[PDB]
């Protein structure tokens, strides 16, 4: 795929949308609407969004994602301010919370087991 | 029939269709021996081309 | 053939498997069984209705 | 990534217990199959029972064998080929082949690979504009420019089964969007219970046995009809023979009753 | 066969059993009857309409 970068809430930037070409395979602000609607809350760190183009449609592959799932559950927007030791904000996920994030991920993830899936998310959470 | 299947296996294996040979296959199957039925069967099979009978049949 | 008749004969009695019966019948014939031939027949047999296959005759 | 094991004798040691834990042990070929395809194939196996690791660390079936009493040495010619795995399973032999061998995923052929089956390219417009048509011609695919597009003149076989596909051959086919083979874990081999099965076995006929069954069923049926030996199936036919033969004497003769 | 023709022939006359007739016809042929073959045919015959089986021809 031919990939692209995005900021939360952005539309119609000259540098980012125009030279990279407007998906929909023409007519930006088609996609410019589509990405923007989806994007969620405040901009923060940039995410990938990834472009795939079809006949007169655009689709984006967007994972802020499993970690943005963590943000919703904890009710904490940041990430680990002081890496791997102890976070500055006090975002301790519960054990019950993490298996439900794992349940939902289990389609996107390969993972064999639910217990396997819990490690994979937990490894993401700690760091 | 267990008795007919026992006869065709005995001929395929190359062993004669007699009371002892049918009785050993019949016992291995776990089906009880009945003297009258294997005796009729050997008697019916006497004087037969097993090969010629096996192939035609409607 | 040996194998075909052996499982058919058992089917008439109503029951069958690798060691317990297939091996037992052919051994009762006095013949040494090839394992590969038993394994192939059993693997083929799984999930098949033997009675239905008989009901068309071919 | 660093020097630390990257284990030797330790991963072998896990592997040791793995042949011994499971009855049925498979020698299998990833080489062809993509890894969304392999990884999916493996997902299936994994629920049921699982696959583990080696090189020559794999060939050490001997140590495992040495622990028990089963093979050495004794095996026919240790069948291992490039690109081999071991599948340890509960799953009986015959079923494992039908999962793996039947359900393969598709993908494209490769340069310098031996074609597994015949390759053909179709006639019709490639849709591509004028350029180096010559490249196609080099392979022995006839093409010519019709209507300002490159078109392939005819269907023909570019490569046969058992011949290698040339580097040029492969690249040009990929541009056409022509692929076609089935990929997944080719089965080289099986161990179960003191017995060695090679791949001919492992493609497991079955239709032939139906025909043989039905024919065996007819042998029994025949024997029954003609012989007269009246448990349940034969009986009504056996009675009919004694007529078939009377009604019959009438047809040739020339007494009328 | 001997047995088949013998009971059929009697059926035409309209009556049959083990000793009384089956044995009598085959004995009139001059042949020694196997009891097992008579018993099998009779056991098969019970509760069968011979006339109906004839009415399909096979």
From Swiss-Prot, chain A:
GO terms for biological process: cytoplasmic translation; ribosomal large subunit assembly; translation. There is a cross-link at residue 119 (Glycyl lysine isopeptide (Lys-Gly) (interchain with G-Cter in ubiquitin)). It comes from the Eukaryota. One of its GO terms (cellular component) is cytosolic large ribosomal subunit. Component of the large ribosomal subunit (LSU). Mature yeast ribosomes consist of a small (40S) and a large (60S) subunit. The 40S small subunit contains 1 molecule of ribosomal RNA (18S rRNA) and 33 different proteins (encoded by 57 genes). The large 60S subunit contains 3 rRNA molecules (25S, 5.8S and 5S rRNA) and 46 different proteins (encoded by 81 genes). Belongs to the universal ribosomal protein uL11 family. Present with 68500 molecules/cell in log phase SD medium. There are 2 genes for uL11 in yeast. This is Large ribosomal subunit protein uL11A. The gene is RPL12A.
From Swiss-Prot, chain B:
N-terminally acetylated by acetyltransferase NatA. GO terms for biological process: cytoplasmic translation; translational elongation. It comes from the Eukaryota. The gene is RPP1A. Keywords: Acetylation, Cytoplasm, Phosphoprotein, Ribonucleoprotein, Ribosomal protein. The 4 small acidic ribosomal P-proteins from yeast can be classified into two couples of similar but not identical sequences. Each couple (P1A/P1B and P2A/P2B) is distinctly related to one of the two acidic ribosomal P-proteins P1/P2 present in multicellular organisms. It is found in: Cytoplasm. GO terms for cellular component: cytosolic large ribosomal subunit. The lineage of its organism: Eukaryota, Fungi, Dikarya, Ascomycota, Saccharomycotina. Its main location: cytoplasm. It comes from Saccharomyces cerevisiae (strain ATCC 204508 / S288c) (Baker's yeast). GO terms for molecular function: protein kinase activator activity; ribonucleoprotein complex binding; structural constituent of ribosome. Belongs to the eukaryotic ribosomal protein P1/P2 family. This is Large ribosomal subunit protein P1A.
Swiss-Prot record, chains C, E:
The gene is RPP2A. Keywords: Cytoplasm, Isopeptide bond, Phosphoprotein, Ribonucleoprotein, Ribosomal protein, Ubl conjugation. It comes from the Eukaryota. The modification Phosphoserine is found at residues 40, 43, 49. This is Large ribosomal subunit protein P2A. It is found in: Cytoplasm. The lineage of its organism: Eukaryota, Fungi, Dikarya, Ascomycota, Saccharomycotina. GO terms for molecular function: protein kinase activator activity; structural constituent of ribosome. Belongs to the eukaryotic ribosomal protein P1/P2 family. The 4 small acidic ribosomal P-proteins from yeast can be classified into two couples of similar but not identical sequences. Each couple (P1A/P1B and P2A/P2B) is distinctly related to one of the two acidic ribosomal P-proteins P1/P2 present in multicellular organisms. Present with 428000 molecules/cell in log phase SD medium. Component of the ribosome, a large ribonucleoprotein complex responsible for the synthesis of proteins in the cell. The small ribosomal subunit (SSU) binds messenger RNAs (mRNAs) and translates the encoded message by selecting cognate aminoacyl-transfer RNA (tRNA) molecules. The large subunit (LSU) contains the ribosomal catalytic site termed the peptidyl transferase center (PTC), which catalyzes the formation of peptide bonds, thereby polymerizing the amino acids delivered by tRNAs into a polypeptide chain. There is a cross-link at residues 2, 48 (Glycyl lysine isopeptide (Lys-Gly) (interchain with G-Cter in ubiquitin)). GO terms for cellular component: cytosolic large ribosomal subunit. The modification Phosphothreonine is found at residue 16. The chain holds residues 1 to 58 of 106 of the full protein. Coiled coil: none annotated.
Curated annotation (Swiss-Prot), chain D:
It comes from the Eukaryota. Transmembrane segments: none annotated. GO terms for molecular function: large ribosomal subunit rRNA binding; structural constituent of ribosome. The keyword Cytoplasm applies. There is a cross-link at residues 14, 97, 144 (Glycyl lysine isopeptide (Lys-Gly) (interchain with G-Cter in ubiquitin)). The modification Phosphoserine is found at residue 68. One of its GO terms (biological process) is ribosomal large subunit assembly. It is found in: Cytoplasm. Component of the ribosome, a large ribonucleoprotein complex responsible for the synthesis of proteins in the cell. The small ribosomal subunit (SSU) binds messenger RNAs (mRNAs) and translates the encoded message by selecting cognate aminoacyl-transfer RNA (tRNA) molecules. The large subunit (LSU) contains the ribosomal catalytic site termed the peptidyl transferase center (PTC), which catalyzes the formation of peptide bonds, thereby polymerizing the amino acids delivered by tRNAs into a polypeptide chain. Component of the large ribosomal subunit (LSU). Mature yeast ribosomes consist of a small (40S) and a large (60S) subunit. The 40S small subunit contains 1 molecule of ribosomal RNA (18S rRNA) and 33 different proteins (encoded by 57 genes). The large 60S subunit contains 3 rRNA molecules (25S, 5.8S and 5S rRNA) and 46 different proteins (encoded by 81 genes). The 5 acidic ribosomal P-proteins form the stalk structure of the 60S subunit. They are organized as a pentameric complex in which uL10/P0 interacts with 2 heterodimers, P1A-P2B and P1B-P2A. uL10 directly interacts with 28S rRNA.
């Amino acid at each position: 795929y031919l990939y692209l970068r995005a900021v939360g809430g952005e539309v119609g930037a000259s540098a980012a949308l125009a030279p990279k070409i407007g998906p929909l395979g023409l007519s930006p602000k088609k996609v410019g609407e589509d990405i923007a609607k989806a994007t969620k809350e405040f901009k923060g760190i940039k995410v990938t969004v990834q472009l795939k183009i079809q006949n007169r449609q655009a689709a984006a592959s967007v994972v802020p994602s499993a970690s943005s799932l963590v943000i919703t559950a904890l009710k904490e927007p940041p990430r680990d301010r002081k890496k791997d030791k102890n976070v500055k904000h006090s975002g301790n996920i519960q054990l019950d919370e993490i298996i439900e994030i794992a349940r939902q991920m289990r389609d996107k993830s390969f993972g064999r087991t639910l217990a396997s899936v819990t490690k994979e998310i937990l490894g993401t959470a700690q760091s | 029939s267990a008795l007919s299947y026992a006869a065709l296996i005995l001929a395929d294996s190359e062993i004669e269709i007699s009371s002892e040979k049918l009785l050993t296959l019949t016992n291995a199957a776990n089906v009880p021996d009945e003297n009258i039925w294997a005796d009729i069967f050997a008697k019916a099979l006497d004087g037969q081309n097993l090969k010629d009978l096996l192939v035609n049949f409607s | 053939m040996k194998y075909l008749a052996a499982y058919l004969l058992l089917n008439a009695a109503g029951n069958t498997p690798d060691a317990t019966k297939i091996k037992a019948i052919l051994e009762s014939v006095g013949i040494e069984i090839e394992d590969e031939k038993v394994s192939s027949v059993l693997s083929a047999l799984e999930g098949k209705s033997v009675d239905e296959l008989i009901t068309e005759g071919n | 990534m660093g020097g630390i094991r990257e284990k030797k004798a330790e991963y072998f040691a896990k592997l040791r217990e793995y042949l011994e834990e499971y009855k049925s042990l498979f020698v299998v070929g990833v080489d062809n199959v993509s890894s969304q395809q392999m990884h999916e194939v493996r997902k299936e196996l994994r629920g049921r029972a699982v696959v583990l690791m080696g090189k020559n660390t794999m060939v050490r079936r001997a140590i495992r064998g040495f622990l028990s009493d089963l093979p050495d040495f004794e095996k026919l010619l240790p069948f291992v080929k490039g690109n081999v795995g071991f599948v340890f399973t509960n799953e009986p032999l015959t079923e494992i082949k039908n999962v793996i061998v039947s359900n393969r995923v598709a993908a494209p052929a490769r340069a310098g690979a031996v074609a597994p089956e015949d390759i053909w390219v179709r006639a019709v417009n490639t849709g591509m504009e004028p350029g180096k048509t010559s490249f196609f011609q080099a392979l022995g695919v006839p093409t010519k420019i019709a209507r300002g597009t490159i078109e392939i003149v005819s269907d023909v076989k570019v490569v046969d089964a058992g011949n290698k596909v040339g580097q040029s051959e492969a690249s040009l086919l990929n541009l056409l969007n022509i692929s076609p083979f089935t990929f997944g874990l080719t089965v080289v081999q099986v161990y179960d219970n003191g017995q060695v099965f090679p791949s001919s076995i492992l493609d497991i006929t079955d239709e032939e046995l139906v025909s043989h069954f039905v024919s065996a069923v007819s042998t029994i049926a025949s024997i029954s009809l003609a012989i007269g030996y009246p448990t349940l199936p034969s009986v009504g036919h056996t009675l009919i023979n004694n007529y078939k033969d009377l009604l019959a004497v009438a047809i040739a003769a020339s007494y009328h009753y």
